[PDB]
Structure formats: structure tokens, C-alpha cells
């Protein structure tokens, strides 16, 4: 017997790693990650503590996984929809300020510089290219901010010019030196080869206002659009913009925008129909195949079984593209065969209906193994004596299938089918790679095509359409199509 | 339809579950299979169904070979030992399943379903699924499913085993009613002796996969061919005693009890057999057998008494009508009638009884 | 936080990243600063995500068009080569790597489409597009055809469409006018008409795609094609006796392919800007540095004047640079998204006969103009 003490021991031991890692998350700054990990671990311990929460012991590991990698992402995606997180507004405010404060402008002259040893101290040479004058400092030591008086010279320095290596090692201390020309100009290191009058483009006023030290123009945070705009607002706006909250703006933008709504309904219908036909054809093709391949009279079954899933064992990406080549209207071996036998050449990309047929053929090829494999397993739950009964009732194979096999499978297949509908609803990748959504829907102001799903036409708006990649718009649409497919599971 | 087997053998690889079985069942005959648990009753029945393969031998149904014909094409129907109900289907839907298959006529179906469910007292359960039924109720749905289909041959495997006594009585009757009205062949498996006796035109006794005997109910009861049948037909079991002179038309043997009485038997190291119902009160008979009472079972209608006799290893079971007040350890005496005695050879076979029974 | 005192570089998997690593090994020998070169998958999308949080590589190598985006997002340092350094590179390349009138990356190589021809079928390659329908007729007698190219992607058809005044967005003077779009005008219609007419006359096929075009040139079935420097090694393996030359003229005017300039940008978040400047200016962008990468995997035509002139002793590279120079720099503005789809659709519509050239391009202009506005 593994001790009864051993339980309250391991539970105390793990309940200690919790804290050691939680208060340790409270440090530096990881607060969202501390609150979240507290509720999750505490639920874990209590659940394994009192034997009244027994059943949860079985659910908790799985639900924890799900919350972590399914739920949490969903929450952020929704969260993002209430902000203008995009290509144009990608940085946090703090980061954008930090970028603007790293910006520089050349205020004065530029001098190539040299580093020369004087015993165990150093000497700094500058060379004024534009006058042919040369300057050299007194012997100094490295370390901290220091100012150096440079004097005009005609002589070479005594030391041998230092390496790039030596310049590099001393780059920190070197970058802290302010050199002063005879004529009163300050000059600091701007590269590994040059000292110059490089200066910070903006200064932080501390009340929020950034002011340009070249134009004199002034800028404040405008948290309405997420940019530094001039000052009461001016006409000029500084990039980079920052991410900022926009309430309902991305959700309305889909409802307010006449023109992105012209083909909505018509594309929606096609997506519903595409999903339904796919699910139907894949469940039906897969179920039959699974039935045939468990039939003990069928002597090739073990081999057939393997070969029938290969469309799922190869990654779909190459396959889709090979299908695109296969379906080429003038070339491509399908229409070259339909040329010979049957004498026709279907317009698989040019013609809306034949394109849709193509897409459904390809999808069924991709999706039948999945439904097959499920059925291969589900079919084992049907007891064999039910077919002895059916035999004694005068049943044939066809009758067996429809009165016993199909009704006994559709129940456990129902959730898998509803899910396959939702997945195929959003099957962005297939349409993009195969048809790009074409052929073209004529007169669509924001461009749409006949085989576009809802996802394909919508992400065209958010990610193409020329405004850069609008993550907020896309998140909001993702939520909207989610609340739509959720209401379609009615 | 008629059904006949011809040198039918059945092997599970090398375990023989049916050996050389030969049966002629004539159209309209009611045949019952009896035999010990695991002797091959359901296997035989399943071979007729086509749910099992015949290894060697011929099977014919209505004068045509069926070995190779599949179950669905034999014109047969079966009540399964384990019922084998459709779990997704209601009682009504289970019962109407066969009919729905071969020419569904809405009203015809409803009618024959309602009628059969009434005699099976299932009318209030028509809408339930099999999981919401009792064991006996499920057994009757299985029956209903086969009766409704009206096959050419009815196969019924222990179809009343989980019904109460009074309902069993009623079901036998209805099975009989239907056997006279349809005049189609019925093959019926049961462990109940009363059902075997009252239903059967023929009883086929089975032992470890081979046919021990075939005959009329009363034929097997009065005239069993061997020790096994004798001990299998009629319950309580026929008593056995290990029994010098041999007349030219009857046999004489000696009782093993230490007095060594000698008695004649109207027949052809023997075993003598006498049924508990055939033993007589002490005062009547010539041959008296006396020992100690071991077990007394009060059945209400009758009393059954087990008696340990000197030098006789096996207890002796006695049946006597009405409530007899006898107690364990008491002395009991009974009469051994010679004309009602059976006799069995060293191997097992019976010496044909010549006393004519009514 | 990018780690101080070292250099992490990202470059695509089809570039000579091993070559670049030897340049980094030299840099380390001279400076003691270790250089690490990575080639992660989808680095063009990975960078914007790590760099925003102040991380990622110190230097990123990609085509210039993507750098206008990163720049806008606040992810690229403003670079400062002096006039002496700028003189070392072709001046048109410096136009490619500007955001809001400021330099944001170092041009490395130059990429554009050229005319590829079979010498054994066509010894003297035609200088004009109009010459081709005649030339296809004499090839059709011997079983071959004159010209097959990717008719499906606007990138491949735009050169002819552009020749007579077709353009994306007007490149005014450093600035791209978002409102001035040239896919509707006279020369666009003329370009696209000449193409449609080649299909109409069965010299070409409306559904010839990259794959089919390439396979026919490599099997010696078509006398010429239009394709980039990435195509040459297939042809080398095929052993087709081939030449790369200047794209044919349309109504007396040069084909205008799009120009892709491979460029190196410094991460705005890097604490190693000065180290990056030194590496890029004095180590990579030298005859010796660029030859290290080229030897690994060929760079094509490079922006370094001195090294281009030795590479150009190969007629193929010369041809590339020529077509580059006569072509259109790819605009580095977000609005190019809308351009691509609209134009790709318009060509397909006109080629497959769903729409006439006029309305097809009229519609494609409408789609870009209203996308770029609202």
C-alpha cells in the first residue's frame, strides 16, 4: 500500500511549488499570469483534496488544457476586436514613445576619428575632412561620462592607431565621451568610425508633449486614433502609431459599410451549401468505405484500407496545388481525358457552377478519410447479433445499412458532423489555394468572387484592400462569423 | 414447410458440437428439442436458421437443399435465446420489423402488431425502447417479432424461460392455437418438461451433440432407449439401483441391499430404474424397500421424500400426493413395482419393456 | 530585449546564408562580435511580431516592398550612410529603401524578369512584341510555339501592360500618390489588348500558368519564355541551350517589369546599431563580402556598382540589370495589396473573355481607387 500519509504529503509538496512560482511571478511584473495561475492550481488542489469533488478529477486535467490553449486565445482575439491593433498601430504606447525617443538628426559636423595609445592612457584624434584640419586630445582614461578638450595639431600622435577590435571593446566608454572642438562645438561618437554632432530629434517634456528639436513643432498623445499628432490638433501625425481602444468601431464598421454588404448574403448561402454538401459527401463516402472494408468476405480489405486513407497521410497543401494543375481547363490531365472519353472540356475555373463542383470534388477527396476512420471505430460498437436478427427478419445488405447501420452511427456522428460543418464553413485555405475565390463577381466594389467563402472575402478586406493588416477589424469579423455559426447550431 | 437433416455434422475446428444428426420433420409438425445445458440445442437450431455453417451433411427445407442458402432466403424466423432486440427501435417497431422489410402495408402492419401484442400482453408497452422493459417483457417482444412475421418455419429457443407460471400457461396455449391455425412447422427448444410434453408432436432428445432418441412424448417417458434418456425425461429424475436368473421372456436380478431379494422384470451387472411417481406405499406391494428419510420437500400439491437405504449409495426419491407429515431421520418404507421397473445394460442401453402402458 | 554585443541576422532560405556566415566569421575575427545567421520559415511575418515587443534579429534581409510596412510600424532604424557610401550603389536602388523620404535599409541585390529564349530554335531573339504573332506562325509549322509565360499572375503580365504608360501608383518625387492610379489609362488598355489578341489568335492560351510555361520551355516546346533568375538552374539541369536577354519592346517602348531589391534593415530596437552599420557597410557591401554570399547561392544582380560590373560579364546578369533599370520599382506602400487582386482579376476576366479589356481595367481601377481611399 502506497501510504495514506503520502497523499497529504504530495499535495503539500505541489501546493508549495504553487506560491514558490506564484509570488515569484508577482515579482518583476507578471500579474495577469499570477492571478490566472492561482485560480487554476487552487482548483486542482481542492478538487484532489475533498473526495466530494471526485468526478472533477477526471475533467480537470482536460479542461485545464482547453482553457489554456483554446479558451485563452479566443478571449484575446475577442479583446483585440475592441482596439485598433493593426500594421499601422502595432506597438504599445510605451514602445512607440521609446522608438520616437531613439530617432536622431545630424545637427553639426562629422569627423572621422582615431584612437591612439599614450602609454596606458588614450588619445583621441579627429580629422576635419572639409577643411583638412586635424585635432588631438590630451592623454585620458576610459570610464564614465567625460569631456575632452581637443586641440588643433600638425603633428601625428605618438601611439600606433588602434584596431577596430580595440575600438569595439571600448565602445561603451567611447560613446560616453563628449569631444570639444577649439571653436566650441560638442561632438559625440555616432559610429565606430565617426564622431559627429548627432542629436535626439525629440525631447520628452514630461507633461506628455513631445517636441521636435529641428522644426520646433509640438506633438501630444492622441488616444482617440493612437498617434502623436501635432498641437488644438494639427494636420501632421507621427508614425509609429500605437495600439488603443476603439469600443465598437470594428464591429459597426461591418454593419455601417454598405458595399462590403452587397454580396454578403449570396456568399453566405454558398458557404452554407459548400459546408453541407462536403459534410454529407464525406460522411456518406467514408461510412460506406468503412462498411466495405470491415466485410470479412472482402479478401483485399487490409490493403484497401491503407490506400483509402493516403489522401489524409500526405499534407493537403501540395495535394490542393496538384489538383489545381489537374483541373487546368486547357492543360491538366482531367480535361485531357474528358477530351478523349466524353468529348467535353468543363470550364472548372471560368464557370461558377463547375468551379463549385471542382471545389466540392477536391474537398470530398481531402475529407472522406477522416469520416472513414471515425466510422471504422464507431462500427465496432454495433453488436453482431443485430444482423443475425435482421437476417431472421429477411434483411439484405442494402436494408441492413439503412435500418440498422446508418441509424446506429448517426447518433455518435452527430457532434462530429456539426463540427465538420463549422470547420468547412471557415475553410479559408482550400478556396485561396485552389480558386482564389473566382471566378469574379462583377460589380463588387470591395472585390468578391463566386467560390469565395465568407472567411475568404472578409479577410481580403482586413488584410488586403490596402490599409495594411487590420487585426482589430479581422478579430471583430471572426467574432461575428462565430456568433453566426453558433446561432446556426440551432 | 418441411425440414430434414441428413448426416449433419458440425465442428468448431476439431471440437464436434453436432455428430451425425438425422431428422425428418414433416410439414405442420411441432418438434421440441430437449437436452442438458450445452449439448448443442441452439447450435442445431442456428444451423437450420443459417446463422451457423454446416460442416458436413445435407439440410433441406421444403424439399430443397439449404446448406448454402443464406439465413434471409430460407423462409425461417427465430426467437433468440438472448432475444437479440433492436435497441434503437420501439416495441412496435421491433415487432413490425420483418413485415416492414418485405412489403410494408401500413394498416396490415398495425393490425397484426396490435393483435399479437394483445396475446403477449404487451399492448401498454408498444412505445417503449427495450432498455425500459423487464427481462420477461423483452422475451415476449422477441416472440412477438417472429409471430408477426409468420415465417414458413418457426424456430423458438427457450422462449418462455423468463415468464411466470400463469403467463407461461397462457403462452403455450397461444403457441398451440397458432400451430393448429397455420399448420406450419415449429421447432421449439425448452428446459420445461411440461412444455415438452404438452406441445410436442415429437421430442428430440439430445446428448453431447448427438441424437439420443426421437419419439412421442409418452413414448420417451414409458419407453426410453438408454440410461441417459431415462434420467433426462421426467423430473424428479428416475432413481437408479445397481442390480442372476434370466427367463426366456423376462429378466431376474438381485437387489444390492444386504438381504439380497430377487425379483422378475418383464423385459428382454444391470442398472434398475424406477420413477418416484411409480413407487408405491409400503402396505400394497410385495417388494418392500426401507431406509432413512434424508430430505423432505413440501410442494403444496405433493410431498417428495429422499430415503437413504442400507448398502445403496444413492438416495431414493419418492413422490406422494398431498401434504405428508414426515421428518428428517425418520424411517420410511416403499413398494417396488416390477412391471413399472426399467432395466439397463452395463454400457447404457435399455432392455425393451413389454408391459403395455395406457 | 535584444542581446547586446552580438549580431543576429535573418535571411530567407533561398539566399546564401552560409556565405553570409563566413562574412560574419570575418567580422568576428576583426571585432570579437559574434554574428549568427538564421533563416526561419515565414520570417517576413515572424519579424513584425517579435520586433514590436522589442525583440527579433538585429538585421533582417527581405525584399524592399515589405520594409515600407515595417518602417511605418516603427520597427526599422533610420540608417545613415554618407554621400561617399551612397555613390557606391546604383542610385535607383536607394529610391527603393526610402520611407517618408528617409533611408531605412541597405540595398543588396536587384531582381527583375527577363526574356529567356531557346538558341537552337531561335538564334536571334525578337526585340519587339509585335514581331511575335508572325514568329509563332513559322514555329507552328515545325510543331513548336514562340512564347509561353505565366498568363495567370499580374506580376508576369504587367511588363507588357506597363510599356505604354500603365503603372501602379504615380511615383511623383520620392512620394507615391495614393490617388493617382494608372491601370485604366490608354497604355494599360493597349498592353492588355495586345496580350488578349495573342490568345485570340491562338499564339498563347488564356489558362497557361507558371508550371505549364516552365515545363514547355524546359522540354524545348516553346522557343521563349518570361521568368526571373530563380528559374535558371532548372534550365541548366534541362540542358536547353538558352540565353537571357532584354524584354521585347511594346510600341517602341521598353517592357517595365517590377523591380525587387533585396535589402538589409536594422531593427529599431537593437542595441547594436553601430555594430550593424559597420558589418553592413564595410564587411558585406564590398566585392569580397558579396562574393562570399554569391558563391554560396547566386545573388543575381547586386546594387554594389563595383561588384555588379564583374558579375555583368555574364550576359544573363547583365540582362537582368538592364530590365531592372528600365522597369518599375515595387511600391513599398500598404495600398499595393488592393492593386494585386484587382489587377490579377482584370487580366483573367479579359483573357478568358468574361469581360472586354476596357471595362475589365475600368473596374480594376475603380477597385484600387476606392480601396486606397476608404
Amino acid at each position: 500500500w502506497q501510504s495514506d500519509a503520502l497523499k497529504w504529503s504530495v499535495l503539500g509538496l505541489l501546493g508549495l511549488l504553487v506560491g514558490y512560482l506564484v509570488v515569484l511571478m508577482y515579482a518583476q511584473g507578471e500579474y495577469l499570469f499570477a492571478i490566472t495561475t492561482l485560480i487554476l492550481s487552487s482548483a486542482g488542489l481542492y478538487i484532489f483534496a475533498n473526495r466530494k469533488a471526485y468526478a472533477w478529477r477526471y475533467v480537470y486535467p482536460g479542461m485545464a488544457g482547453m482553457g489554456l490553449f483554446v479558451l485563452f486565445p479566443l478571449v484575446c482575439t475577442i479583446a483585440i476586436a475592441f482596439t485598433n491593433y493593426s500594421s499601422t498601430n502595432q506597438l504599445t504606447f510605451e514602445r512607440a514613445q521609446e522608438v520616437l525617443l531613439d530617432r536622431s538628426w545630424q545637427a553639426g559636423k562629422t569627423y572621422n576619428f582615431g584612437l591612439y595609445p599614450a602609454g596606458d592612457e588614450w588619445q583621441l584624434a579627429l580629422s576635419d575632412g572639409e577643411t583638412g584640419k586635424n585635432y588631438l586630445s590630451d592623454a585620458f582614461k576610459f570610464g564614465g561620462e567625460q569631456k575632452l578638450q581637443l586641440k588643433e595639431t600638425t603633428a601625428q600622435p605618438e601611439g600606433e592607431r588602434a584596431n577596430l577590435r580595440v575600438i569595439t571593446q571600448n565602445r561603451q566608454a567611447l560613446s560616453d565621451i563628449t569631444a570639444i572642438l577649439p571653436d566650441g562645438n560638442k561632438v559625440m561618437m555616432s559610429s565606430l568610425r565617426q564622431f559627429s554632432g548627432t542629436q535626439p530629434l525629440y525631447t520628452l517634456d514630461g507633461d506628455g508633449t513631445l517636441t521636435n528639436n529641428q522644426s520646433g513643432v509640438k506633438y501630444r498623445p492622441n488616444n482617440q486614433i493612437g498617434f502623436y499628432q501635432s498641437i488644438n490638433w494639427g494636420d501632421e501625425k507621427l508614425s509609429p502609431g500605437y495600439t488603443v481602444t476603439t469600443g465598437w468601431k470594428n464591429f459597426t464598421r461591418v454593419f455601417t459599410d454598405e458595399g462590403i454588404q452587397k454580396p454578403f448574403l449570396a456568399i453566405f448561402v454558398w458557404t452554407v451549401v459548400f459546408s453541407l454538401i462536403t459534410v454529407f459527401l464525406t460522411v456518406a463516402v467514408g461510412m460506406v468505405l468503412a462498411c466495405l472494408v470491415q466485410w470479412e468476405a472482402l479478401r483485399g480489405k487490409a490493403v484497401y484500407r491503407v490506400l483509402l486513407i493516403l489522401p489524409y497521410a500526405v499534407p493537403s497543401f501540395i495535394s490542393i496545388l496538384i489538383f489545381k494543375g489537374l483541373f487546368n481547363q486547357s492543360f491538366g490531365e482531367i480535361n485531357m481525358m474528358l477530351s478523349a472519353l466524353f468529348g467535353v472540356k468543363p470550364a472548372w475555373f471560368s464557370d461558377p457552377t463547375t468551379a463549385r463542383t471542382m471545389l466540392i470534388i477536391v474537398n470530398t477527396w481531402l475529407g472522406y478519410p477522416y469520416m472513414m476512420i471515425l466510422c471504422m471505430g464507431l462500427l465496432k460498437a454495433i453488436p453482431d447479433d443485430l444482423y443475425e436478427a435482421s437476417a431472421m427478419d429477411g434483411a439484405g445488405p442494402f436494408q441492413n445499412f439503412f435500418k440498422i447501420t446508418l441509424p446506429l452511427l448517426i447518433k455518435p456522428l452527430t457532434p462530429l458532423m456539426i463540427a465538420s460543418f463549422a470547420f468547412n464553413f471557415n475553410n479559408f485555405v482550400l478556396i485561396q489555394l485552389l480558386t482564389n475565390g473566382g471566378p469574379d463577381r462583377l460589380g463588387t466594389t470591395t472585390p468578391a468572387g463566386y467560390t469565395d467563402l465568407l472567411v475568404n472575402y472578409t479577410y481580403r478586406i482586413a488584410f488586403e484592400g490596402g490599409g495594411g493588416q487590420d487585426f482589430g477589424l479581422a478579430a471583430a469579423i471572426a467574432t461575428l462569423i462565430f456568433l453566426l455559426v453558433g446561432a446556426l447550431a440551432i | 414447410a418441411s425440414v430434414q437433416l441428413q448426416n449433419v455434422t458440425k465442428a468448431w475446428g476439431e471440437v464436434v458440437v453436432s455428430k451425425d444428426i438425422n431428422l425428418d420433420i414433416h410439414e405442420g409438425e411441432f418438434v421440441v428439442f430437449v437436452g442438458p445445458s450445452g449439448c448443442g440445442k441452439s447450435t442445431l437450431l442456428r444451423m437450420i436458421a443459417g446463422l451457423e455453417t454446416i460442416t458436413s451433411g445435407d439440410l433441406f427445407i421444403g424439399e430443397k437443399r439449404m446448406n448454402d442458402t443464406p439465413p434471409a432466403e430460407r423462409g425461417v424466423g427465430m426467437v433468440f435465446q438472448s432475444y437479440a432486440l433492436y435497441p434503437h427501435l420501439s416495441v412496435a417497431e421491433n415487432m413490425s420489423f420483418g413485415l416492414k422489410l418485405a412489403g410494408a402495408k401500413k394498416e396490415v402492419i398495425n393490425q397484426r402488431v396490435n393483435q399479437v401484442a394483445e396475446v403477449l400482453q404487451l399492448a401498454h408497452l408498444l412505445d417503449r425502447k427495450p432498455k425500459a422493459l423487464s427481462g420477461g417483457q423483452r422475451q415476449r417482444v422477441a416472440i412477438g417479432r417472429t409471430l408477426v412475421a409468420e415465417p414458413s418455419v418457426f424456430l423458438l429457443d427457450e422462449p418462455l424461460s423468463n415468464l411466470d407460471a400463469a403467463l407461461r400457461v397462457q403462452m403455450r396455449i397461444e403457441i398451440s392455437r397458432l400451430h393448429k391455425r397455420l399448420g406450419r412447422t415449429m421447432i421449439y427448444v425448452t428446459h420445461d418438461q411440461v412444455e415438452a410434453m404438452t406441445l410436442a408432436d415429437k421430442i428430440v432428445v439430445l446428448d453431447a451433440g448427438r441424437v439420443a432418441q426421437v419419439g412421442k412424448p409418452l413414448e420417451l417417458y414409458h419407453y426410453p432407449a438408454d440410461r441417459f434418456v431415462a434420467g433426462f425425461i421426467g423430473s424428479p429424475k428416475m432413481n437408479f439401483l445397481p442390480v442372476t436368473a434370466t427367463a426366456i421372456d423376462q429378466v431376474q436380478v438381485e437387489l444390492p441391499m444386504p438381504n439380497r431379494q430377487q425379483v422378475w422384470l418383464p423385459v428382454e451387472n444391470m442398472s434398475l430404474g424406477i420413477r418416484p411417481e411409480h413407487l408405491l406405499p409400503s402396505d400394497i406391494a410385495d417388494v418392500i424397500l426401507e431406509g432413512e428419510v434424508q430430505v423432505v420437500e413440501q410442494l403444496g400439491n405433493e410431498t417428495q421424500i429422499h430415503i437413504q437405504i442400507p448398502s445403496i449409495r444413492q438416495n431414493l426419491v419418492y413422490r406422494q400426493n398431498d401434504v405428508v407429515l414426515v421428518e428428517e431421520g425418520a424411517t420410511f418404507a416403499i413398494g417396488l413395482p416390477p412391471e413399472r421397473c426399467h432395466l439397463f445394460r452395463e454400457d447404457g442401453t435399455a432392455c425393451r419393456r413389454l408391459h403395455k402402458e395406457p | 530585449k535584444i542581446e547586446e554585443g552580438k549580431l543576429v541576422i535573418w535571411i530567407n532560405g533561398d539566399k546564401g546564408y552560409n556565405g553570409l556566415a563566413e562574412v560574419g566569421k570575418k567580422f568576428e575575427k576583426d571585432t570579437g562580435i559574434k554574428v549568427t545567421v538564421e533563416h526561419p520559415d515565414k520570417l517576413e511575418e515572424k519579424f513584425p511580431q517579435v520586433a514590436a515587443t522589442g525583440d527579433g534579429p538585429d538585421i533582417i534581409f527581405w525584399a524592399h516592398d515589405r520594409f515600407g510596412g515595417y518602417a511605418q510600424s516603427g520597427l526599422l532604424a533610420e540608417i545613415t550612410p554618407d554621400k561617399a557610401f551612397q555613390d557606391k550603389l546604383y542610385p535607383f536602388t536607394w529610391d527603393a529603401v526610402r520611407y517618408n523620404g528617409k533611408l531605412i535599409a541597405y540595398p543588396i541585390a536587384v531582381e527583375a524578369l527577363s526574356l529567356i529564349y531557346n538558341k537552337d530554335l531561335l538564334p536571334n531573339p525578337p526585340k519587339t512584341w509585335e514581331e511575335i504573332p508572325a514568329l509563332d506562325k513559322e514555329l507552328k509549322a515545325k510543331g513548336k510555339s514562340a512564347l509561353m509565360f505565366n498568363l495567370q499572375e499580374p506580376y508576369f503580365t504587367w511588363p507588357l501592360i506597363a510599356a505604354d504608360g500603365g503603372y501602379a501608383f504615380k511615383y511623383e518625387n520620392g512620394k507615391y500618390d495614393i490617388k493617382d492610379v494608372g491601370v485604366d489609362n490608354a497604355g494599360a488598355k493597349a498592353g492588355l489588348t495586345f496580350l488578349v489578341d495573342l490568345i485570340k489568335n491562338k499564339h498563347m492560351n488564356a489558362d497557361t500558368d507558371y508550371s505549364i510555361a516552365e515545363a514547355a520551355f524546359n522540354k524545348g516546346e516553346t522557343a521563349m519564355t518570361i521568368n526571373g533568375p530563380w528559374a535558371w538552374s532548372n534550365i541548366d539541369t534541362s540542358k536547353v541551350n538558352y540565353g537571357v536577354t532584354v524584354l521585347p519592346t511594346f510600341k517602341g517602348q521598353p517592357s517595365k517589369p517590377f523591380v525587387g531589391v533585396l535589402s538589409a534593415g536594422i531593427n529599431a530596437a537593437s542595441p547594436n546599431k553601430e555594430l550593424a552599420k559597420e558589418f553592413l557597410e564595410n564587411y558585406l557591401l564590398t566585392d569580397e563580402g558579396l562574393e562570399a554570399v554569391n558563391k554560396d547561392k547566386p545573388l543575381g544582380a547586386v546594387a554594389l556598382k563595383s561588384y555588379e560590373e564583374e558579375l555583368a560579364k555574364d550576359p544573363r546578369i547583365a540582362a537582368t540589370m538592364e530590365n531592372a533599370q528600365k522597369g518599375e520599382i515595387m511600391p513599398n506602400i500598404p495600398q499595393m495589396s488592393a492593386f494585386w487582386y484587382a489587377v490579377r482579376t482584370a487580366v483573367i476576366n479579359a483573357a478568358s473573355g468574361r469581360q472586354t479589356v476596357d471595362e475589365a481595367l475600368k473596374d480594376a481601377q475603380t477597385r484600387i481607387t476606392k480601396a486606397s481611399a476608404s
Binding site: 511571478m25 488544457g65 478571449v75 482575439t77 483585440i80 486513407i309 489537374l326 453558433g486 447550431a489 | - | 525584399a63
Partner: protein
């Protein structure tokens, strides 16, 4: 066991399967063709006119003597990619079986408030569009890494961990199956004094063995073919899975088709073995003889 009928039905089935198999094999035979074609060409004849072993050599570790004479070493470790794929997919799959089986058990056999909401929440929430997910995920494993570096960025641990959340559907699949099995077996088990855990392990699991193979298979496939998450988490070339590594062959203007195809064909091999192996758990009549009825 049953007396079989017409063997004209077998002939028609063999004929239809064969014709179906040729049809669904054709696209894959062209992938194989691309892998054996000299150069990198997405198209051409089923038997390539100019056959080449080079793509398979570089995938298998061999150096290639080319036209001018210089020897080309394999640019990538394709076989180690493949091994990294087996490991991530195999461990992943084991974890997804274990997590969803136990979960399905509570859903199928125990009662707890809001069980129904949870089950419908589970199926609903996994059906949210995965479009802004990788942003959330990176930010997650970046944080996690500094506390448990074994499951941080650039670790197989993290990738395996990332997949373990994808269980909702497998849960409903095993629940579904658990419910086909008669309660009375675990009822009997419970009266033999078996704990709910013991009933689960010793009675219900062995009878559920086929649906265990299904979820193992469906998970292994998912893991092997998976690109976005693995590619977002793995940095080091020598830790790449095969799906991530083969992305190197794809460039903006062209693909190394021959090498991509060899990679693609190679990735089907572990799917095929795992499928072959799992057949031993795909049996009929596991419950035959248990419950009269």
C-alpha cells in the same frame, strides 16, 4: 460464421474499390512523380521523362555529384526532422488519448452540475475561428518559458503541450462510444467492489479499444501535418518537425517541388505505420456474450 450467399457482389465491389482507389491515388502518384523528376517541376508526365534520384538522396542524407563535378552536401537534416515529427506526434497523441478518455468517462458515467453546459461549451468554443490565436500562444509560451523552460519556446515540450488543448471533439467521440456499452458491466464491476477508476481501467477501457485507436490515429495525423503552431514555437533547425522544415522549400517566387514532394511522401510513412499498427485494436464483437438482451 453465417452462411454466405451470389459472389457477383464481391466481384462488383472489388471492381468498384479498384476504380475508386485508382481515382483517389492519381493525385498522390503525381506527388511521387514530382519527387522523382529532375529539376523542380510541379507538372509533367506520370513517369517522368527525365528521372532523378537527387531529391530523395538529399532527403535521405546522401551527397549529390552534380553537373560540374562538385559535391552538394545535404542542405537539411530531413530524416531527423522526420524523427522529431514521430516524437512530437506520438507523445502528443498519447497525451490526447489519456486526457480525453478520462474526460469522456466523467461525461459518460458520472453526474456533476452543469455537465451539459460544459459539454456544449466544449464543442462550441473549439469551433471559434483560429485567426488571431498564434499571437496569444506566442505571448503565452514566452512567459511560461522562464518558469518551466522544458515547455517554453524552441522546445518539443511546448509544441506537445500546445496540442493537448485540442480535445473537445475526441472527448465527444469517446463519450459517444462509452455510451454504446451496457452500463451493467461496470455495475457488476462496482458490486465486485471495483472503484470507479478500476471499473474504468479494467472493464470499460478494454471494451473501448477501437475508439482509442481512432483518437490515437486522428491525433497522430493532425500532429504530423501541423505547421503554424510548430513553426511559431520552434527556432532551431535541428529541432524542426518535418512539416516545419519542408517550408524551407517554399519561396515567394518558386518552390523546390522535388524536395517538397519527397518530404511530403516521407511524412505519410509514419501515418501509414501507425495506421497499420492500430488495426489490432480495431476489432468487432468485443461485447459479445456479456449482456443477454
Amino acid at each position: 460464421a453465417m452462411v454466405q450467399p451470389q459472389k457477383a457482389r464481391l466481384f462488383i465491389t472489388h471492381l468498384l474499390l479498384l476504380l475508386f482507389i485508382a481515382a483517389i491515388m492519381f493525385p498522390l502518384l503525381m506527388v511521387v512523380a514530382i519527387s522523382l523528376r529532375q529539376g523542380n517541376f510541379a507538372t509533367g508526365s506520370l513517369i517522368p521523362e527525365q528521372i532523378s534520384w537527387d531529391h530523395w538522396k538529399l532527403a535521405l542524407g546522401f551527397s549529390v555529384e552534380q553537373a560540374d563535378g562538385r559535391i552538394t552536401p545535404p542542405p537539411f537534416p530531413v530524416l531527423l526532422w522526420l524523427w522529431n515529427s514521430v516524437k512530437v506526434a506520438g507523445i502528443s497523441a498519447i497525451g490526447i488519448v489519456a486526457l480525453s478518455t478520462t474526460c469522456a468517462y466523467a461525461f459518460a458515467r458520472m453526474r456533476f452540475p452543469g455537465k451539459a453546459t460544459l459539454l456544449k461549451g466544449m464543442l462550441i468554443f473549439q469551433m471559434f475561428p483560429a485567426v488571431l490565436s498564434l499571437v496569444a500562444l506566442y505571448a503565452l509560451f514566452d512567459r511560461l518559458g522562464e518558469y518551466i523552460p522544458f515547455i517554453g519556446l524552441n522546445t518539443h515540450g511546448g509544441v506537445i503541450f500546445a496540442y493537448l488543448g485540442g480535445i473537445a471533439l475526441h472527448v465527444w467521440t469517446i463519450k459517444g462510444y462509452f455510451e454504446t456499452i451496457d452500463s451493467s458491466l461496470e455495475e457488476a464491476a462496482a458490486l465486485d467492489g471495483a472503484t470507479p477508476w478500476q471499473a474504468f481501467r479494467l472493464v470499460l477501457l478494454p471494451l473501448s479499444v477501437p475508439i482509442l485507436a481512432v483518437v490515437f490515429i486522428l491525433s497522430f495525423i493532425a500532429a504530423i501535418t501541423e505547421v503554424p503552431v510548430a513553426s511559431l514555437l520552434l527556432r532551431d533547425v535541428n529541432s524542426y518537425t518535418l512539416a516545419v522544415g519542408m517550408q524551407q522549400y517554399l519561396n515567394p517566387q518558386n518552390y523546390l517541388w522535388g524536395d517538397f514532394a519527397a518530404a511530403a511522401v516521407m511524412s505519410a510513412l509514419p501515418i501509414t505505420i501507425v495506421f497499420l499498427l492500430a488495426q489490432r485494436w480495431l476489432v468487432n464483437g468485443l461485447t459479445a456474450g456479456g449482456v443477454k438482451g
